[PDB]
Design a protein around this ligand. Structure first.
Ligand code: SF4
Lengths: 216, 56
């Protein structure tokens, strides 16, 4: 069991348990600890009701996005293993399991990493992929091989050293890793790649064409 | 060919047709024996994605 899960157990036993269920939505009950980091004025760890909207969480506790809410570009809601979401989705999304599943990202560890419009989002996703490459245990074939493969592909993507077709290739590579590994580290390495491809494909193609005509 | 004109007339009369139009020997209208390199395109299955072997 997780430390947070274990820690709340005595409070749940004492105060009632039915008191715990009074917070958040149905099947999304209780209170949660959130870690807001990245491009925010006041990065911090806070405690909040489970089903709080993401925008209210960022504005009230973290002091808002750097440069205002209009400067928001992307949010990873639940740690690096969860797919990212753009600003158009963060406007009304709720910070619980089911709502974030409906947004195709999942809640995860409730660690909100905020990136504004001045960041190289491809570089950030590549850094996450490199983290997963360095943290793979190498036991099983899909993780041990495909994560390093995706790491090389994303390194080439950052410089634009690829062609647009490879984007689809990368997608399929991730699909060959997800659901086929022993543990969920392969899934958590494939998911950010899928989120980046799903929401920021034009950025990839623009970088590719810039590299193409820059190098003839 | 290098045949004399009178010999060409005699050949044309004997055969009944114009021989110099269609010579059996090849002088210069053939392809050069040194050619530029080709490029040789690839087949339909040379895609990078949506190319699973079980579908083809
Ligand atoms: S998926 Fe899990 S078990 Fe398989 S190599 Fe990666 S870390 Fe090891």
């Amino acid at each position: 069991a997780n430390v947070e899960t274990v820690a709340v157990s005595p409070t749940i036993c004492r105060r009632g348990g039915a008191w715990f269920a009074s917070f958040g939505r149905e099947r999304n009950s209780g209170t949660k600890l959130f870690n807001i980091s990245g491009h925010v004025n006041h990065p911090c760890t806070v405690e909040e009701e489970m089903s709080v909207p993401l925008k209210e969480l960022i504005e009230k506790h973290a002091g808002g996005v750097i440069g205002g809410w209009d400067n928001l570009l992307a949010v990873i809601p639940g740690g690096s293993s969860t797919p990212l979401i753009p600003k158009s989705v963060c406007e009304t999304v709720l910070m619980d399991f089911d709502a974030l599943v409906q947004a195709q990202t999942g809640l995860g560890t409730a660690a909100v990493i905020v990136m504004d419009r001045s960041t190289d989002i491809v570089k950030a996703i590549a850094r996450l992929i490199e983290f997963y490459k360095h943290e793979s245990c190498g036991q099983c074939t899909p993780c041990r091989e495909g994560v390093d493969w995706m790491n090389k592909v994303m390194a080439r993507f950052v410089k634009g050293d690829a062609r647009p077709a490879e984007i689809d290739s990368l997608w399929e590579i991730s699909k060959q890793i997800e659901g086929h590994t022993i543990c969920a580290l392969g899934d958590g390495a494939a998911w950010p790649v899928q989120g980046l491809i799903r929401h920021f494909r034009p950025e990839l193609e623009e970088r590719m064409q810039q590299f193409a005509l820059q190098h003839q | 060919a290098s045949a004399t004109r009178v010999i060409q007339l005699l050949r044309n009369w004997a055969s009944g047709r114009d021989l110099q139009a269609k010579l059996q020997l090849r002088y210069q209208e053939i392809s050069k024996r040194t050619q530029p390199p080709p490029k040789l395109p690839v087949g339909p299955s040379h895609k990078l994605s949506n190319n699973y072997y079980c579908t083809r």
